[PDB]
Design a protein around this ligand. Structure first.
Ligand SMILES: Nc1ncnc2c1ncn2[C@@H]1O[C@H](CSCC[C@H](N)C(=O)O)[C@@H](O)[C@H]1O
Lengths: 202, 285
């Protein structure tokens, strides 16, 4: 149950070794058809991610931006989910104000980051309506999602095992397994998971 | 400070703690930002048509009777979810199939924008399908975030699929035709406003959308031909043609309306040298 993680390329990790999770969360580097100072996954690479094996019943949290607000809906459907909510993170500055200036979108300026919420199967043991669908938190970077989301997800689905994709070191959390290519090595604690890992990668 | 935890504890929504959201006193501490908005609003006011409106049963109406073509269309079909989620409607509610059947492409100008109020549930997905059907590309999402400073805290939750409390509505923005920000500054002023509107949740039975949506649209597109479909008596506004089933009077004349935009007039507002020197622009390549 303590924080666990796997430094890996998510396109190639045999994700069936991880078992089933009540919540999946992903913050992928979408191809937004723009020049970016970081690498992205192609649309086909995103479509091909083996999200379906990670869960049979539960929730998906998929951060989206740009053209991915439609591609993310497509992926939710390719992976077998239906969209039932959409959280926005409203970005504030040091004085709890909206940053209104600059040119931060193509047509209008951008004050928020969106996260699609999908459901799969027949989840049980969840609590509806505990949190709002608006998060207010100061920006460090838009990639750096707010830690508030972990408490919302724990209040939604307490005590269940959860998996995060494209996480960074700071994202590791109790009850979560974190996958990403900038994590420090491999640190599993669940005996069944490492048993299946050792069998698949000895 | 975890404002999500704080909502769980107190019922005060996180958006209650965003500072300086009011429209009127927005840039009070930044005179050049305030001047940009002031000058653009003056430009809009100088060039606005007098209000025009038409009572029409939009589901039976031949929409092609609305002429000339429109540079911006604001669409606010009465969704059942507006009344059910907060209470009984005094007009026909529209399903997303009803909305999709509208022939918006027949009245949109070849280069133009649409602003579609979609609610907070299935409309976020089905409104995107409507955009496709009408020939627009979804290009922004303006969220109306509602504070509950007056009556904390946790309210309605009616959608068997929802898992969070829904405290916002989405107005999807769509683009039709080819518009290039670098060359089409006589049609759009991009980046003057942000894609958020923050106001207190309206009173019970008040289904109006915030008037700031008009300011965002008018600042962004210099086209003067502006249609508000499903507007009401209370939304009538200079610079707009308002068409809807609950209007109690009609003054629209298509020929008179068109005459405001034809020679010697233009369908575009134009711009002043002062606004050109204040508005956000790209740097030299
Ligand atoms: N193919 C891939 N496999 C695993 N990780 C990848 C990857 N491509 C990009 N990444 C990583 O995914 C991360 C996405 S940015 C991290 C955002 C994170 N949610 C946060 O809150 O901070 C980056 O570390 C990036 O290096």
């Amino acid at each position: 149950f303590p924080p666990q993680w796997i430094c890996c390329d998510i396109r190639y990790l045999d994700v069936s070794i991880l078992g089933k999770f009540a919540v999946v969360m992903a913050d992928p580097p979408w191809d937004i058809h723009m020049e970016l100072p970081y690498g992205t996954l192609t649309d086909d690479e995103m479509r091909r991610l083996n999200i379906p094996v990670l869960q049979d019943d539960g929730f998906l949290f998929l951060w989206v931006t740009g053209r991915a607000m439609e591609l993310g809906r497509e992926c939710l459907n390719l992976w077998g989910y239906e969209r039932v909510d959409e959280i926005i993170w409203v970005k504030t500055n040091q004085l709890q104000r909206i940053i209104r200036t600059g040119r931060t979108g193509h047509w209008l300026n951008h004050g928020k980051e969106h996260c699609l919420v999908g459901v799969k199967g027949n989840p049980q043991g969840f609590n509806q309506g505990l949190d709002c669908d608006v998060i207010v938190a100061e920006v460090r970077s838009t990639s750096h999602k707010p830690d508030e989301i972990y408490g919302m997800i724990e209040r939604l689905s307490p005590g269940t095992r959860k998996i995060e994709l494209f996480g960074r070191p700071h994202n590791v959390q109790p009850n979560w397994i974190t996958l990403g290519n900038q994590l420090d090595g491999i640190h599993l604690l669940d005996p069944d998971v490492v048993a299946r890992f050792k069998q698949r990668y000895p | 400070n975890d404002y999500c935890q704080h909502f769980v504890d107190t019922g005060h929504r996180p958006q209650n703690f965003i500072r300086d959201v009011g429209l009127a006193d927005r840039f009070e501490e930044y005179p050049k930002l305030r001047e940009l908005i002031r000058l653009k609003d003056e430009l809009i006011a100088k060039s606005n048509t007098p209000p025009m409106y038409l009572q029409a049963d939009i589901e039976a109406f031949d929409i092609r009777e609305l002429t000339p073509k429109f540079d911006v269309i604001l669409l606010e079909p009465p969704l059942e979810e507006y009344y059910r989620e907060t209470i009984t409607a005094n007009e026909k509610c529209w399903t997303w199939d009803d909305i999709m059947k509208l022939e918006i492409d027949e009245i949109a100008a070849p280069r133009s924008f649409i602003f579609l109020w979609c609610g907070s549930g299935e409309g976020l997905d089905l409104g995107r399908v409507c955009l496709r059907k009408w020939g627009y590309r979804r290009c922004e999402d303006i969220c109306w975030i509602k504070t509950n400073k007056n009556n904390p805290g946790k309210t309605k939750t009616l959608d068997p699929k929802a898992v969070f409390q829904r405290t916002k509505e989405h107005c999807l923005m769509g683009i039709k035709g080819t518009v290039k920000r670098s060359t089409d500054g006589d049609f759009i002023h991009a980046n003057v406003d942000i894609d958020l509107i923050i106001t207190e949740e309206p009173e019970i039975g008040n289904i109006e959308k915030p008037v700031e949506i008009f300011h965002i649209i008018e600042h962004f597109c210099l086209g003067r031909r502006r249609l508000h479909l499903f507007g009401r008596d209370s939304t009538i506004r200079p610079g707009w043609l308002t068409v809807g089933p609950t209007l109690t009077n009609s003054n629209y004349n298509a020929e008179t309306y068109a005459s405001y935009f034809s020679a010697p007039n233009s369908y575009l507002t134009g711009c002043t040298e002062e606004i050109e020197r204040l508005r956000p622009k790209s740097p030299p390549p």
